[PDB]
Ligand binder design. Structure first.
Ligand SMILES: CCCCCCCCCCCCCCCCCC(=O)OC[C@H](COP(=O)([O-])OCC(O)COP(=O)([O-])OC[C@@H](COC(=O)CCCCCCCCCCCCCCCCC)OC(=O)CCCCCCCCCCCCCCCCC)OC(=O)CCCCCCCCCCCCCCCCC
Ligand code: BCL
Ligand code: BCL
Ligand SMILES: CC[C@H]1c2cc3[nH]c4c(c3C)C(=O)[C@H](C(=O)OC)c4c3nc(cc4[nH]c(cc(n2)[C@@H]1C)c(C(C)=O)c4C)[C@@H](C)[C@@H]3CCC(=O)OC/C=C(\C)CCC[C@H](C)CCC[C@H](C)CCCC(C)C
Ligand SMILES: COC1=C(OC)C(=O)C(C/C=C(\C)CC/C=C(\C)CC/C=C(\C)CC/C=C(\C)CC/C=C(\C)CC/C=C(\C)CC/C=C(\C)CC/C=C(\C)CC/C=C(\C)CCC=C(C)C)=C(C)C1=O
Ligand SMILES: CCCCCCCCCCCCCCCCCC(=O)OC[C@H](COP(=O)([O-])OCC[N+](C)(C)C)OC(=O)CCCCCCCCCCCCCCCCC
Ligand SMILES: COC(C)(C)C/C=C/C(C)=C/C=C/C(C)=C/C=C/C(C)=C/C=C/C=C(C)/C=C/C=C(\C)CC/C=C(\C)CCC=C(C)C
Ligand SMILES: COC(C)(C)C/C=C/C(C)=C/C=C/C(C)=C/C=C/C(C)=C/C=C/C=C(C)/C=C/C=C(\C)CC/C=C(\C)CCC=C(C)C
Ligand SMILES: COC(C)(C)C/C=C/C(C)=C/C=C/C(C)=C/C=C/C(C)=C/C=C/C=C(C)/C=C/C=C(\C)CC/C=C(\C)CCC=C(C)C
Ligand SMILES: COC(C)(C)C/C=C/C(C)=C/C=C/C(C)=C/C=C/C(C)=C/C=C\C=C(C)\C=C\C=C(/C)CC/C=C(\C)CCC=C(C)C
Ligand SMILES: COC(C)(C)C/C=C/C(C)=C/C=C/C(C)=C/C=C/C(C)=C\C=C\C=C(C)\C=C\C=C(/C)CC/C=C(\C)CCC=C(C)C
Ligand SMILES: [Fe+2]
Lengths: 254, 53, 60, 281, 304, 43, 53, 44, 44, 43, 60, 44
């Protein structure tokens, strides 16, 4: 089929490249519409619904049938967005115009705003296929032993202000994945509080947490159960801790 | 032709304004460059030639 | 006690100059780092055999 | 312009330079100091590309080409019509890329997320620079860099590779290839796995990480984990681009001949050279 | 300041043997292993594999393939182990001579190639079916098979189809480490400059885009791993600040974003389109276009 | 009906002003295309 | 024309001014380079030749 | 009435007057320079 | 022309002064490097 | 209006000093430009 | 409120720079006045007849 | 070598800093004018 132009200079090669342009167009449509299942409809700063809802239309709802009888999730949906919707937000408009920030009115690590923001995931924990909780403390996880690395337990917890606040007590693990997610602290104030392993750097003599300072370690959200931890508590904790890279920087030393 | 203002009951003036501003600027730049690439309308080369430089 | 300028205008003037010169010092640091980078590159190139500067062109 | 959750993150802060000056958004976009810089540089480079092709009289986007100065120009700045445009566009492109990275940084620290992304991008900037800045300087002339044409930097690739015969024999090139292929492979596998869990057979419940781990253990006897695969693909891309930069910086500076002659050090080892057998006997 | 690249503390437990969702447990193994060298970068469990029918087909056929090529390597080496370990890379099970056309080659090298290729055929297709079945038994989707099928498409186009269309098994790829590189070069050189194969350019675009995308995705998910972004299946259904922060990073950066499921959709396509476009661009080389630089000149992306 | 929150009167005013600006733009453009056609016709 | 002032009832001075500065400086640099691109209109080389330097 | 920005007609007229002052100054400078460049080297 | 002082009500002056320092120093090096390139205008 | 926290008085002061420095800059720059026209003219 | 530098060292540094630059500005003013003086002198000399630059020397 | 800070107990630092500014600027012009005099070292 060499030198065979159907019309003009158009041969199988040209037909194929053009067909590809067409398929590609449809494909960009498909993907940028499937990236709309979360976040849309578009809002203003007032919480309203805006005129520009994008040039790509929000797609038709699908359904996720969850394991362990957790129900049906429909995306896109109003229930989905309204559950994960935050209210009572400690924020103040910086200007009547749009496209400008919104300042935190109070303590942001607590008020759950900015890098310290959290999202109302459901106060039910994360489960494995068998329906057992995903995160167990290493003591309830039968058979779990440190197979390598520095066992942090019992090491002091240095913080961003270089001061010390407590000692590690237990390790919270992803049993199905066999890895350490959270570590627990026996704080000086007599309280137990979790901190994500990804935010704690195990040294030989200690555990360093450069995110937050010491005043903050006490006001960290707690757990209603000492053997389990839900997705909600996880988001609250993780946001609180991560917000210290911005909101406790005047305290961070070295 | 008597109810065009109703367009602003449809589109938001901020976006429309920014859009048409960009549109006009790029359009103008492209037309200018087009002429500038056609040496019979390249005002610079012309003025060079007309004034003998 | 020393460092005390009574005048409001002189206090504002020495502050603004400090701000401007700070910025210019940042820019100079950046320019100097770029310069050291490129120049050290050229020099390390002078350490290379002569066939480096003989290579044919790709015409592009 | 906002998503249903974009508000509580639109707070001030997270700015390396500037402050209130430039802490705002334009549509979806965040524009700080470095947003302004990258816009300026990008726009300028674009307009200069267009003027360069306008001077040439070319208007086809595929045949538009702004080429570097001659090799004889050496490392001096040239007339705009013989390399100066390419050079200014290179300046502007590099400023734009670095500013994009620093913008990403500002955003990463406003949203309180790590700085892995600008790091990844830095390798790409490093390679672009290796091509248009370093390798020339060490080779003595800007003209050894590539042009800004859709179908002409390919001609630069071809000619530059055939200068040293089949570039395939460069080992660092081999590693770049291998890591690129493995990157595409792992990308497809990750996407397919996740979609196959979330979107299973009809009439079945959503799946979990345990099913992914089990499916790939079944298939090949090992699963790297949900975190390990991201770690892995990231490192694959980075080492690829690392090897790709290493392959080019040593091509015309330390090496000068066909790349095939490199592997002949293994043949020419005295205890199997004279052997008459095989390909090399 | 912990970037989560290397795991600090390892833990383990009784091995995670599996999930019984319709899998035949007897075709599964029961022995595992821990190897901490990986635990640093991933899971350490070299876990149980599945030993099935399709898997046995694949293993047998592909091992015959491998050892066949090694046999011809030996014969080509004079049976001298030192020649083998000298010319190992320069050796080749070169492809049949063009004289035979598409007929069964009337030589040794040629028929050995033909047989090794039959073995590869069996192996690859068995493995594809094994992917389909392992995803059907655990009740998962077949995305992995339709991705692999893309790779198979290219591989076939190179070994089986393109030649049949050209009438010569000479066109197919030799089984060597340097000879298949030489084949690629000679393929480009014979047919114009392959760069001007628009579908080659597209496959390249998607390879580079796959690297782009995986670096993006991985760096993101490690950036939001401090909010458990690594657990994705649970952020598709129960969205948290990880997904929100990632989406908003990319929005504020480039104006658009994705979701913890749609980025996976983007990945599955940048991957397969590398080998879908390649297959087409290789098919069309020599069957529709004997030279690509001239096609370009005629089609306007190359100058006269 | 209003997808943006305007009323007919706010719209009418905005439109008078937009029209003023547009006619000014067109006016300058006409002046200029005229000067051009006098200086180097393209037709 | 009488009521152009309402533009600031639409846009904010800050973003508008950032835009204006960027755009004007960009345009200036662009046109200066356009000129320096011509062997004519390049004040530097022109003066170099005029004074025989 | 309508203000997506907060400024009432009063602040708007003020700001506009000053902005136009600056604009006309800019334009005066540019006109002067263009006349000069015409004297030295015309382009039409 | 006399109400230009109102710009400091728009932009923080600290950052504006730092930015002007940067802008002016960079412009200076730009022109010096432009001039240095030309043999007629190079002085070294 | 006052987006930045400054009043007309503070702004007047700051502008006075800024323009002081500005006129100083322009003075020095026109001096140097004159001297350069002396050395290597460009028009 | 603006102009407030919390740090003691930065406050001392911007003050001392102001003092030094003040002095250098004084010196520059003086040099410039001297320069204008001499140069205006030379120029006004260019306005004089040619016999001014012809005069014999006193050898001293 | 470490007790040199005691000079600011001898001389008022305000005046010393102004004086250094003067001295250094004048030294600079002195050498620039020395160098400018010599054709080999003049750059204009
Ligand atoms: C003049 C012309 C002008 C221009 C014309 C342009 C016209 C455009 C029209 C629109 C086309 C848009 C297509 C894209 C939509 C896909 C969106 C998506 O990602 O998922 C959709 C969605 C995926 O579902 P899900 O979310 O995964 O969950 C579904 C289940 O719950 C759970 O899932 P499951 O496990 O049950 O099944 C998973 C599967 C759902 O889909 C399926 O189950 C079926 C998928 C197709 C498999 C093949 C069909 C069976 C027969 C194959 C024959 C092969 C022969 C070889 C030997 C046999 C091998 C088996 O998920 C997918 O992602 C399906 C898409 C797969 C596409 C094909 C990828 C491999 C192709 C590699 C190349 C090989 C062929 C050579 C091509 C070149 C030829 C020149 O599926 C659909 O919407 C329906 C399926 C669509 C059927 C296929 C039609 C499109 C194929 C296009 C391929 C590219 C062609 C080349 C372009 C032209 C070049 C010249
Ligand atoms: C990598 C080493 C070689 C190189 C070798 C090749 C080869 C080989 C090919 C190209 C191809 C491409 N290269 Mg490349 N390319 C190089 C350097 C660059 C640079 C750069 C800034 O340095 C850019 C912007 C490009 C641009 C391009 C696109 C025109 C095209 C698809 C790339 C792609 O999908 O990216 C992946 C990322 C994305 C999918 C995002 C999309 C980015 C867009 C498409 C880039 C367009 C830029 C625009 C036209 C110019 C700016 C104004 N290349 C260097 C010099 N490149 C392919 C092609 O088809 O060319 C005709 C091709 O065959
Ligand atoms: C100098 C020679 C020509 C050239 C000639 C060719 C030719 C010829 C081809 C391409 C092709 C490709 N080239 Mg090249 N290529 C050139 C220039 C470039 C440049 C560049 C920067 O200049 C780049 C980046 C590329 C890019 C690419 C890729 C985008 C593409 C192949 C992707 C792939 O996955 O292949 C590898 C993918 C496969 C082969 C999939 C195979 C999968 C099967 C299932 C493997 C079986 C496994 C087996 C049993 C082993 C078992 C292992 C053990 C179990 C462990 N080329 C030059 C200009 N290139 C390909 C293409 O698509 O053509 C358009 C191709 O064939
Ligand atoms: C979508 C395009 C990319 C791709 C994808 C891809 N490949 C795949 C898959 C997917 C999605 C699998 O599921 C499957 C797999 O198991 O991956 C881990 C596979 C696979 N692709 C493989 C390799 C591979 N993929 C490659 C690339 C690519 N395949 C593309 C870049 C390449 C190269 C060089 O391009 C190679 C070499 C295998 C690891 C595996 C195919 C397994 C197979 O068929 O094995 C047969 C042989 C034996 C069982 C015996 C071997 C005997 C010797 C001892 C060795
Ligand atoms: C975990 O989940 C995840 C998501 O979801 C949470 C995601 O979305 C993503 C993000 C990934 C995607 C969206 C997938 C698609 C991505 C690609 C195909 C990559 C290639 C991208 C492009 C081709 C688009 C590139 C666009 C660019 C560079 C933007 C161009 C815009 C400008 C130059 C304008 C910039 C304007 C500025 C700075 C302000 C102007 C200033 C003024 C004063 C005016 C990932 C990775 C992810 O992992
Ligand atoms: C040439 C290739 C595309 C270049 C990029 C053009 C788009 C851009 O930069 O911004 C679009 C803008 C930039 O952001 P934006 O904020 O203007 O987009 C808003 C999008 N909606 C309205 C849907 C919310 O983004 C979009 O339009 C969204 C979808 C774009 C998808 C582009 C993916 C291209 C991938 C190419 C792969 C194949 C390569 C071969
Ligand atoms: C190779 O191909 C070539 C090009 C050579 C040949 C082929 C050419 C082809 C295929 C050409 C095809 C052309 C077609 C299909 C053209 C179609 C054109 C149409 C449909 C044009 C429509 C234009 C409509 C306009 C301009 C409408 C303007 C409307 C307004 C300004 C009114 C504003 C509306 C308001 C305010 C809405 C009121 C709202 C409320 C709430 C009351
Ligand atoms: C190959 O292609 C080539 C280029 C060769 C040929 C083709 C060229 C083409 C296709 C060209 C197309 C050109 C077009 C479509 C041009 C359109 C131009 C338009 C529509 C211009 C409009 C301009 C309008 C302006 C400048 C309006 C300005 C308005 C104001 C300044 C006032 C703003 C409003 C205010 C203040 C009211 C606010 C009130 C309240 C109550 C908030
Ligand atoms: C490639 O094609 C080429 C380039 C060859 C040809 C094409 C060229 C083109 C298309 C060029 C286009 C040029 C244009 C569109 C130029 C437009 C210029 C304008 C609109 C300039 C406006 C300037 C305004 C200025 C400088 C205003 C300055 C104002 C101030 C410094 C004071 C303002 C003070 C305020 C706001 C204080 C009061 C504030 C409060 C909050 C009370
Ligand atoms: C240590 O020494 C011993 C002997 C013990 C073992 C050593 C073994 C060695 C050294 C093995 C080495 C193997 C190598 C170097 C393999 C390399 C293979 C490569 C690089 C292959 C590259 C590309 C191959 C392709 C694309 C082949 C495609 C083939 C097909 C698609 C087959 C399709 C079917 C064909 C050709 C016809 C048969 C069809 C039917 C239906 C019968
Ligand atoms: C292709 O383009 C090229 C580069 C070739 C040519 C084009 C170049 C362009 C477009 C250049 C543009 C330059 C511009 C727009 C420059 C503008 C400069 C401005 C507005 C400078 C303002 C400076 C203000 C200063 C330095 C004020 C300082 C005030 C203080 C530090 C307060 C303290 C007061 C003192 C010390 C005075 C006591 C007596
Ligand atoms: Fe992922």
């Amino acid at each position: 089929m060499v030198g065979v132009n159907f019309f003009g200079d158009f041969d199988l090669a040209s037909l194929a490249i053009w067909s590809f342009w067409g398929f590609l167009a449809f494909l960009i449509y498909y993907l940028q519409t499937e990236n709309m299942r979360e976040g849309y409809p578009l809002e203003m700063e007032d919480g309203s619904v805006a005129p520009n809802q994008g040039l790509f239309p929000v797609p038709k709802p699908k359904t996720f049938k969850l394991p362990n009888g957790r129900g049906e999730i429909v995306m896109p949906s109003a229930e989905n967005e309204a559950a994960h919707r935050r209210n009572d937000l400690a924020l103040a408009r910086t200007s009547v115009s749009e496209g400008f920030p919104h300042a935190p009115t109070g303590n942001a690590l607590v008020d759950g705003v900015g890098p310290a923001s959290w999202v109302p995931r459901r106060d039910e924990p994360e489960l494995d296929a068998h329906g057992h909780n995903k995160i167990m403390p290493m003591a309830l996880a039968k058979g779990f032993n440190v197979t390598a690395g520095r066992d942090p337990r019992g090491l002091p917890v240095q913080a961003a202000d270089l001061e010390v606040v407590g000692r590690v007590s237990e390790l919270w693990v992803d049993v199905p994945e066999q890895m350490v997610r959270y570590l627990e602290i026996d704080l000086n104030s007599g309280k137990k509080r979790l901190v994500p392993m990804t935010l704690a750097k195990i040294w030989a003599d200690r555990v360093r947490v450069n995110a937050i300072a010491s005043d903050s370690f006490e006001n960290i959200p707690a757990t209603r159960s000492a053997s389990e931890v839900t997705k909600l508590e996880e988001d609250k904790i993780s946001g609180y801790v991560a917000g210290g890279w911005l909101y406790d920087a005047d305290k961070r030393k070295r | 032709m008597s109810k065009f203002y109703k367009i602003w009951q449809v589109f938001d003036p901020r976006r429309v304004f920014v859009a048409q501003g960009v549109f006009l600027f790029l359009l103008a730049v492209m037309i200018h460059l087009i002429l500038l690439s056609k040496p019979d309308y390249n005002w610079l080369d012309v003025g060079t030639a007309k004034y003998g430089r | 006690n020393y460092s005390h300028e009574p005048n409001a205008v002189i206090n504002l003037r020495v502050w603004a100059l400090g701000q401007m010169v700070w910025g210019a010092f940042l820019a100079a640091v950046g320019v100097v780092v770029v310069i050291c980078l490129l120049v050290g590159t050229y020099l390390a190139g002078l350490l290379l055999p002569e066939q480096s500067k003989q290579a044919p062109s790709p015409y592009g | 312009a906002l998503l249903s959750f974009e508000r509580k993150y639109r707070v001030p802060g997270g700015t390396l330079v500037g402050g209130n000056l430039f802490d705002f958004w334009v549509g979806p976009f965040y524009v700080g100091f470095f947003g302004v810089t990258t816009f300026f540089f990008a726009a300028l480079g674009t307009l200069l590309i267009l003027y360069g092709t306008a001077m040439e009289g070319v208007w086809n986007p595929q045949l538009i080409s702004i080429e570097p100065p001659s090799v004889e120009n050496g490392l001096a700045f040239a007339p705009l019509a013989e390399g100066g445009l390419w050079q200014l566009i290179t300046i502007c492109a590099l400023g734009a890329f670095i500013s994009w990275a620093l913008r990403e940084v500002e955003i990463c620290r406003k949203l309180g997320i790590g700085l892995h992304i600008p790091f990844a991008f830095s390798f790409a900037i490093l390679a672009y620079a290796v091509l248009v800045v370093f390798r020339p300087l060490l080779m003595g002339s800007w003209g050894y860099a590539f042009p800004y044409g859709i179908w002409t930097h390919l001609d630069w690739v071809s000619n530059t590779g055939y200068t040293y015969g089949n570039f395939h024999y460069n080992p660092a090139h081999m590693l770049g290839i291998s890591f690129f292929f493995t990157t595409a492979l792992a990308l497809a596998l990750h996407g397919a796995l996740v979609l196959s869990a979330a979107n299973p057979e009809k009439g079945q419940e959503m799946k979990t990480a345990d099913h992914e781990d089990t499916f790939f253990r079944d298939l090949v006897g090992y699963s790297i984990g949900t975190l390990g695969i991201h770690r892995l693909g990231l490192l694959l891309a980075l080492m690829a681009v690392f090897w790709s930069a290493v392959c080019m910086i040593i091509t015309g500076t330390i090496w000068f001949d066909q790349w095939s002659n490199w592997w002949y050090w293994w043949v020419e080892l005295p205890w199997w050279v004279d052997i008459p057998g095989g390909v090399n006997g | 300041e912990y970037q989560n690249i290397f795991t600090q503390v390892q833990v383990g437990g009784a091995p995670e043997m599996g999930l019984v969702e319709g899998v035949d447990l007897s075709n599964r193994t029961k022995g595992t292993t821990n190897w901490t060298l990986l635990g640093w970068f991933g899971n350490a469990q070299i876990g149980p594999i599945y030993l099935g029918g399709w898997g046995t087909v694949s293993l047998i056929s592909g091992v015959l393939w491998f050892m066949t090529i090694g046999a011809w390597f030996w014969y080509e080496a004079g049976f001298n182990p030192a020649v083998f370990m000298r010319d190992l890379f320069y050796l080749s099970l070169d492809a049949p001579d063009a004289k035979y056309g598409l007929g069964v080659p009337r030589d040794a090298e040629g028929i050995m190639w033909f047989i090794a290729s039959f073995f590869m055929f069996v192996a690859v297709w068995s493995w594809w079916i094994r992917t389909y079945t392992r995803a059907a038994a655990l009740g998962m989707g077949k995305h992995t098979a339709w991705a692999f099928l893309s790779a198979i498409w290219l591989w076939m186009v190179l070994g089986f189809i393109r030649p049949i269309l050209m009438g010569s098994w000479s066109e197919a790829v030799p089984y060597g480490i340097f000879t298949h590189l030489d084949w690629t070069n000679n393929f480009s050189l014979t047919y114009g400059n392959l760069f001007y194969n628009p579908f080659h350019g597209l496959s390249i675009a998607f390879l580079y885009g796959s690297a782009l995308l995986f670096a993006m995705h991985g760096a993101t998910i490690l950036a939001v791993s401090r909010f458990g972004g690594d657990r994705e299946l649970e952020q598709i259904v129960d969205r948290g600040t990880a997904a929100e922060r990632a989406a908003l990073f990319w929005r504020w950066t480039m104006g658009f974003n994705a979701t913890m499921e749609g980025i996976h959709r983007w990945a599955w396509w940048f991957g397969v389109l590398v080998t879908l476009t390649g297959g087409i661009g290789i098919l069309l080389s020599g069957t529709v276009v004997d030279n690509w630089y001239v096609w370009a000149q005629v089609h306007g992306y190359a100058p006269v | 009906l209003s997808f943006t929150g305007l009323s007919d009167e706010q719209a009418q005013e905005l439109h008078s002003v937009y029209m003023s600006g547009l006619w000014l733009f067109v006016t300058i453009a006409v002046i200029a295309h005229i000067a051009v056609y006098i200086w180097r016709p393209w037709l």
